[PDB]
C-alpha cells in the first residue's frame, strides 16, 4: 500500500514558461518504476513517459522526466496552449498498482469582477412542493471563491452544493453554480433570500436580495 500525494493541488502557469509537477510517495519504489499519464477532460487518458526514464511513441521531446527514490519532478519546456490538462503519476511496483491525486493547471489571467445574478424560483416549481434558489456567478478568477447564504440573518450549511465549470477557451474564466434547495414549507416562512460573494477583486461583499412575490 503506497499513497501518492501531488502537492500543490493547483498552480497558475503561463503559455511559454516551465511547469514543475511534484509526485510525493509514501515509501521508496524499486527500480524507479513510476510512470506519468495525461488525461483530457472529455477524452481518454494517454501514456507519456513509462518508467520515468524513456519516452513512449508519439510524445514530443519537450516532455522531460527525472528524479529517483521518493522525488519525481516532471519538467516541461514550452507549455503549449493545448496542454492545460490534469496530469497524474502512477507507479507499478507496489503489487498492486496505486494512483495519486493529480494537479490541475490553468492560464494566469488578471482578476476581474464577477456578475452574480440570483434567480428566485417561479410559481410552477412551488406547485410540486420543492423550491430551489440558484446563485450563478460568471467571469471570475481564480476558481477559489466563497459562497454563503444569509437568509433572515442566518447561515445555512449542509444543504447547498457547489458545482463549477471548466476553463473557457476564449475567456479563460470559470462559472460556478450554487443552488439552495429546500422544501415548500420552509420557503413560505422566510422573506429575503440572497447569497454572499467574497471575491479578491472586490473590496466589499455585494448582496443581491429581493422580495417574496413582489418582483
Amino acid at each position: 500500500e503506497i499513497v501518492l500525494t501531488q502537492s500543490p493541488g493547483t498552480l497558475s502557469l503561463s503559455p511559454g514558461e516551465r511547469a514543475t509537477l511534484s509526485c510525493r510517495a509514501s515509501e521508496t519504489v524499486s527500480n524507479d518504476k513510476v510512470a506519468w499519464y495525461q488525461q483530457k477532460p472529455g477524452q481518454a487518458p494517454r501514456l507519456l513517459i513509462y518508467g520515468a526514464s524513456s519516452r513512449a511513441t508519439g510524445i514530443p521531446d519537450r516532455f522531460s522526466g527525472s528524479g529517483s527514490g521518493t522525488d519525481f519532478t516532471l519538467s516541461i519546456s514550452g507549455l503549449e496552449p493545448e496542454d492545460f490538462v490534469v496530469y497524474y503519476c502512477q507507479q507499478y511496483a507496489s503489487s498492486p498498482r496505486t494512483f495519486g491525486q493529480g494537479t490541475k493547471v490553468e492560464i494566469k489571467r488578471t482578476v476581474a469582477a464577477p456578475s452574480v445574478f440570483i434567480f428566485p424560483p417561479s410559481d410552477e416549481q412551488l406547485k410540486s412542493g420543492t423550491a430551489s434558489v440558484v446563485c450563478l456567478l460568471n467571469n471570475f478568477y481564480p476558481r477559489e471563491a466563497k459562497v454563503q447564504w444569509k437568509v433572515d440573518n442566518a447561515l445555512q450549511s449542509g444543504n447547498s452544493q457547489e458545482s463549477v465549470t471548466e476553463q473557457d477557451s476564449k475567456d479563460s474564466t470559470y462559472s460556478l453554480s450554487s443552488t439552495l434547495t429546500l422544501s415548500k414549507a420552509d420557503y413560505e416562512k422566510h422573506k429575503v433570500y440572497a447569497c454572499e460573494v467574497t471575491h479578491q477583486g472586490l473590496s466589499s461583499p455585494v448582496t443581491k436580495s429581493f422580495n417574496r412575490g413582489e418582483c
Binding site: 510512470a35 487518458p45 507499478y92 498498482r97 418582483c215
Partner: protein, 225 residues
C-alpha cells in the same frame, strides 16, 4: 491497437454489474501483457480496481479484496468484469488498457462507458422557468436561465432559440449535480438588454434533447427596461 467498452448504463445498487472490454488486434500469448480496470468518479481521480497477468495469474486490490472477479477468455478476445454489491457513491466511468512490456504500462487506452448506479429509473427531464429579478442597478446585461431537474443520465445539451426561430449562442453551461439520487442542471445566457427592451419577443423557448423524452418549455422574460 484499439479498445472498446460496452455494457449497461443504468443499473440498480446491490445487484449485478457486468462490463466487457472488447479488444481486437493482439493476443495474450506473449509475456508482460495484461489488461486492467481504471475508474474515475466525476470529481475525483483515477482509482485502481484489479489487474490480471498471463498464464492464469490475477491479482486483486486489498482495499476491495474478495469483492471483484476476473474471468478471461481466449476465444471471444474479451474479459468479463462482474461487480457485486454495488454502491451509488461508487458511480464512475470505467476504462481498460493494454500493456506492452514490463516497463510500458497502460499505453493503448480504450473509450469507456458511463455507468450510473442509482435506485431511480429513467424519467423524462422536468423543465421549470426561472424568473430574473434584476432591480436597482441592471448593470450591463440581463440573463435568463432554464432549470433542468429529474433527468437520468446526464446526456442533455442546452440550446437557446429566439421567438422567431433563430439561434442563440449559449456557450456557458453548468454541469449536473447529484440531487438525492437524481441530477439537476442549470444553464443561462447573457442576452443584451438592447435587444430585449426594443424587440417584441416577450419569451424565449428552452429546447433540449434527451433519449428518454424530448421535453421543452418556454421561459417568461419579465424584462427591466
Amino acid at each position: 491497437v484499439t479498445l472498446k467498452e460496452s455494457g449497461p448504463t443504468l443499473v440498480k445498487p446491490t445487484q449485478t454489474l457486468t462490463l466487457t472490454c472488447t479488444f481486437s488486434g493482439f493476443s495474450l500469448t506473449t509475456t508482460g501483457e495484461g489488461v486492467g480496470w481504471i475508474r474515475q468518479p466525476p470529481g475525483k481521480a483515477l482509482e485502481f480496481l484489479a489487474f490480471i497477468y498471463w498464464n492464469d495469474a490475477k491479482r486483486y486490490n486489498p482495499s476491495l479484496q474478495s469483492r471483484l472477479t476476473i474471468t478471461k477468455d481466449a476465444s471471444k478476445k474479451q474479459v468479463v468484469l462482474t461487480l457485486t454489491n454495488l454502491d451509488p457513491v461508487d458511480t464512475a466511468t470505467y476504462y481498460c488498457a493494454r500493456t506492452s512490456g514490463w516497463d510500458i504500462e497502460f499505453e493503448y487506452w480504450g473509450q469507456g462507458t458511463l455507468v450510473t448506479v442509482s435506485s431511480g429509473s429513467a424519467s423524462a427531464p422536468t423543465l421549470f422557468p426561472l424568473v430574473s429579478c434584476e432591480n436597482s442597478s441592471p448593470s450591463s446585461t440581463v440573463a435568463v436561465g432554464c432549470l433542468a431537474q429529474d433527468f437520468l443520465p446526464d446526456s442533455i445539451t442546452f440550446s437557446w432559440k429566439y421567438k422567431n426561430n433563430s439561434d442563440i449562442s449559449s456557450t456557458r453551461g453548468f454541469p449536473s449535480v447529484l440531487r438525492g439520487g437524481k441530477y439537476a442542471a442549470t444553464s443561462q445566457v447573457l442576452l443584451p438588454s438592447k435587444d430585449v427592451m426594443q424587440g417584441t419577443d416577450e419569451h424565449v423557448v428552452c429546447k433540449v434533447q434527451h433519449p428518454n423524452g424530448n421535453k421543452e418549455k418556454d421561459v417568461p422574460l419579465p424584462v427591466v427596461i
